[PDB]
Design a protein around this ligand. Sequence first.
Ligand code: HEM
Ligand code: HEM
Ligand code: HEM
Ligand code: HEM
Lengths: 67, 75, 60, 241, 49, 49, 378, 54, 54
Amino acid sequence: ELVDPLTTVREQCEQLEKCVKARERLELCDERVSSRSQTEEDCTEELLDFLHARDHCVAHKLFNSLK
Amino acid sequence: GRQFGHLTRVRHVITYSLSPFEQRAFPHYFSKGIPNVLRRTRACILRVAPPFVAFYLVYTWGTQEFEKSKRKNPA
Amino acid sequence: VAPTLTARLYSLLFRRTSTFALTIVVGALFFERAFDQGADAIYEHINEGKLWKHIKHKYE
Amino acid sequence: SDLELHPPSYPWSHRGLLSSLDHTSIRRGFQVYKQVCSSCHSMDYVAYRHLVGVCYTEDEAKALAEEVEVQDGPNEDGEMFMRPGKLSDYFPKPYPNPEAARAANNGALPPDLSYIVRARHGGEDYVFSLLTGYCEPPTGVSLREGLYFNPYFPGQAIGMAPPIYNEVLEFDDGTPATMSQVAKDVCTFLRWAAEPEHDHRKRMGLKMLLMMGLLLPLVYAMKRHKWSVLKSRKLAYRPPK
Amino acid sequence: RHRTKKEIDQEAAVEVSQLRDPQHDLERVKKPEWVILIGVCTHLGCVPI
Amino acid sequence: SHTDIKVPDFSDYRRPEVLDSTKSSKESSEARKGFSYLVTATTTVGVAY
Amino acid sequence: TNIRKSHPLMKIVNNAFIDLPAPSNISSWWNFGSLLGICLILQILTGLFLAMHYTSDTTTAFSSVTHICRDVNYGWIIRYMHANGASMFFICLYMHVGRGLYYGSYTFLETWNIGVILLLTVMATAFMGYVLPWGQMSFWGATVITNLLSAIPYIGTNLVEWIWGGFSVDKATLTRFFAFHFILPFIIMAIAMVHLLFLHETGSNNPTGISSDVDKIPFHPYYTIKDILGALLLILALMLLVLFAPDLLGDPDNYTPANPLNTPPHIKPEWYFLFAYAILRSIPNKLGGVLALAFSILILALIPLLHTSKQRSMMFRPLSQCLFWALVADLLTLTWIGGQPVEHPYITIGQLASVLYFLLILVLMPTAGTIENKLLKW
Amino acid sequence: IWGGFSVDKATLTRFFAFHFILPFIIMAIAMVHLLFLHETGSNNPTGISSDVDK
Amino acid sequence: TSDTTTAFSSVTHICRDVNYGWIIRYMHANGASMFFICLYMHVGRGLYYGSYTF
Ligand code: HEM
Ligand code: HEM
Ligand code: HEM
Ligand code: HEM
């Protein structure tokens, strides 16, 4: 039962507009690749964009509280 | 070679000069200073700037085309 | 007091390249120190990330 | 694989120009090195004495070195014994031959942490993000449950397990050790291992700017004063007739 | 290198007379499932990935 | 006829202590030299440090 | 009479930097000669101290360097002043060659050619310099480049193995480079003295390109102090790098000890060669690329025969001013390209900048000159 | 000049470096030897001036 | 190589493995002696002949 500032901050950050759209495009592709078989368009890219938008905002807010 | 006294021939030209301990080192430094620099900039922008923005445009484009060429949609 | 300052400074210390040099060397001594104080004092004030750590971990 | 993502810019307390390192944060980071990485990561260029002026005290430093057995020189029999560990000792640890890293893991060399921050691209930022941004595979690619997944890593797929939440701990005056708060520290320590001079130079740098901020105008005025004569010279042409 | 059935067929289908250094794949290997080469690039000596 | 040669007015460039034709430049020579020499003295001190 | 004038030693000094008649004219672009001199002794001075500690064997190559920055007192500023001094040296070098081209200073055949030799020399010097710490980039940058000579017909092989001291970039290859990187800056300095000897025959050129014999001033106190001030600036630049951004111009990859089987994906030479690297790979030929890369620097020696204007300086010629900066910009493109992977846009744009560089020098500038003459009724 | 408390590792690399740079300075100083020598020309076995038979 | 570990070794490496590294090594060593012989001869001539008046 620990305090994980990363997870606390990730939640509110992972929410925001930019991230929704990328997570949206992610799930879109997720299911696209899930509902196909013998496909190789492998859904890696959409994850990264989501991380960028998320992690950029993760940096601005994080350390501010970190002890 | 070289040396003063043997450089070249000159006649009829007077030169008035002043001891540095008598004048100021920065007369109207900003007063006349800035106007001049603008003037010099103006005098040269059209010759210096254009190739640089041309590079700049080719730089940002070339960069975008690189990044956007490494993703795929259909096919 | 103001003109006579630069003046006296020239009179008593600047003509003779001797004194002129005697002063810059002597002036370099005091300066080197006073600069290192203020400079370090400045480096400290913008920080305080080490040294006051000592008051804690030891003192024995 | 052949696509990548670049680290964000975390507001380190030494990212600033005239900004010293947090020494309290270098300790925690050291500790992070001693238990976790030290069994997989070499740090050949740092020694116990190096820590003295930095974090710990003289005595503190000794005891830390004395908690391992080294291998001092040969004696009379052409031998090789083992020793408590001095101060002159470095941190040469894990495996003898390089391939012993390999055999232990599977190929895979856990590169020495003496120079990491300076040797990746994105300093502590890349390491911190690789340590912290550990995540789960999207789709269409399976690893080999050996080659764990990482987005902040070239090929997004590669080798190291996330030992960053597995929590150890020992902060004398105490601090909670989350994944993140333990990462800043190993990174804040990894900077200093790659650049122990960090703080000293920035002090000189401050002096360098202060000095130059005095010398520069001064030399200018000296040069202005001598050129005076040419700047104000007036010409007149007086030909005959 | 252990080549799969797919790679073997691909090198056999290569239009040989268009090559910079004309050589059929089967005169560069003894066993079609194995290719052995020096990791030295013929241009300036770097190692091919 | 070389008598038509007057030195151009320099008021535009002169230090303030030397603006008056009415008055000696002797009075301010020290101060003027004082000023410029202090500049070099300080410089050397800087370079020295 | 006066000792400064007649003592067999001082004469030199006096006629070189005290009484030497100089144009009242020369501007900041003329400071680079003295800064190049300062860069030289600086590289020699710090470079020496670095050699009192660096050891030249693969076993301790990297190690000694680390030993320097951590254990050796202030070995770090020394190490960084050295590294950054090399970059400062190249900045001034390129600025110097810039001033020469813009202002027509190259009409001094000998002075300029000695300068081309100074260029190749400081270049050859620095290529070897960076192989020393035996970093990934060192070994690899050392491998990529050396091999280039392997394109020379019938002999490239034998030659490359000969300067290698084996069949690869081995132990022989490191000590060798240490030795040459030590002796080259001394020869540089002597050749720079001949640069000055020849330069002193004519005196300096100036911004207008018009002869200035009619308005010469003594080098001291004017250009001793204008030279002092500009050195302080070079110290600012230099110190800003070592004391704040020491690795900014350096690859992080060279901080990882060499490994002959590794081979980074990244693989580029130091910034000061990127433009030439670009030009080289823009050609899909072993011999072509290398030949073209050579022609890329050795063309500085073609410049004088391509002079076409009736005026020496470019100050009064706008078609040429435009072409000049296009040349600068085109090199900046070349730098940029060379720092990028050989893929997508970059290939063809890199091949364009290449042809352009050559068109701009070998044809566009000479032609603009003829037109500008025609426009003046000359 | 030892780089320690004895003739150590510091002491060997040091000497290598100086033994490399000294002969270059020797050579420049030898040029000044010749510069100065050339002011007078060579002396000769008799010690008598030879301008009369150069 | 200039490190105690290989100092002696490299020198031996030179004379045995390095092609003709031995003549080179010996010409070097003996050249130093030849240099001193000439040096002493030179200072000799100077003193005997009064060349030092320069
Ligand atoms: C806080 C302690 C540790 C830190 C800071 C650390 C940090 C790192 C870093 C920065 C790299 C190189 C990343 C890159 O190549 O870009 C790395 C590579 C690696 N380390 Fe760790 N690590 C630590 C503990 C471990 C542990 C416990 C293991 C054992 C699972 C481990 C095994 C590896 C391996 C195998 C690699 C190679 C990855 C690959 O190339 O596939 N390290 N580590
Ligand atoms: C080892 C690097 C070099 C050093 C130390 C060096 C030194 C100098 C110095 C001290 C001057 C005095 C005047 C001035 O700077 O304008 C000068 C001028 C000149 N240098 Fe260099 N130089 C070097 C490289 C070059 C290069 C690379 C070139 C061109 C290939 C070059 C060609 C010239 C020319 C033509 C001038 C005459 C400048 C004029 O009067 O406008 N030198 N150099
Ligand atoms: C004869 C005086 C010189 C000596 C004794 C010298 C010796 C050295 C040594 C021992 C190293 C390896 C240690 C280290 O990297 O810090 C080195 C690195 C280097 N020096 Fe020199 N060198 C001298 C002149 C030069 C010159 C003329 C240049 C060209 C500007 C130069 C540019 C370099 C470069 C590029 C490196 C490698 C990059 C680095 O610093 O990591 N040095 N030098
Ligand atoms: C680096 C070693 C030296 C070199 C390369 C060198 C080079 C020369 C050369 C080329 C000459 C031409 C005429 C002649 O040899 O008689 C000369 C003459 C002379 N040298 Fe040296 N020399 C060296 C050491 C000395 C020493 C050690 C001295 C005495 C302290 C010395 C004092 C003289 C004098 C006085 C002459 C004039 C000889 C005469 O005309 O009779 N030099 N030297």
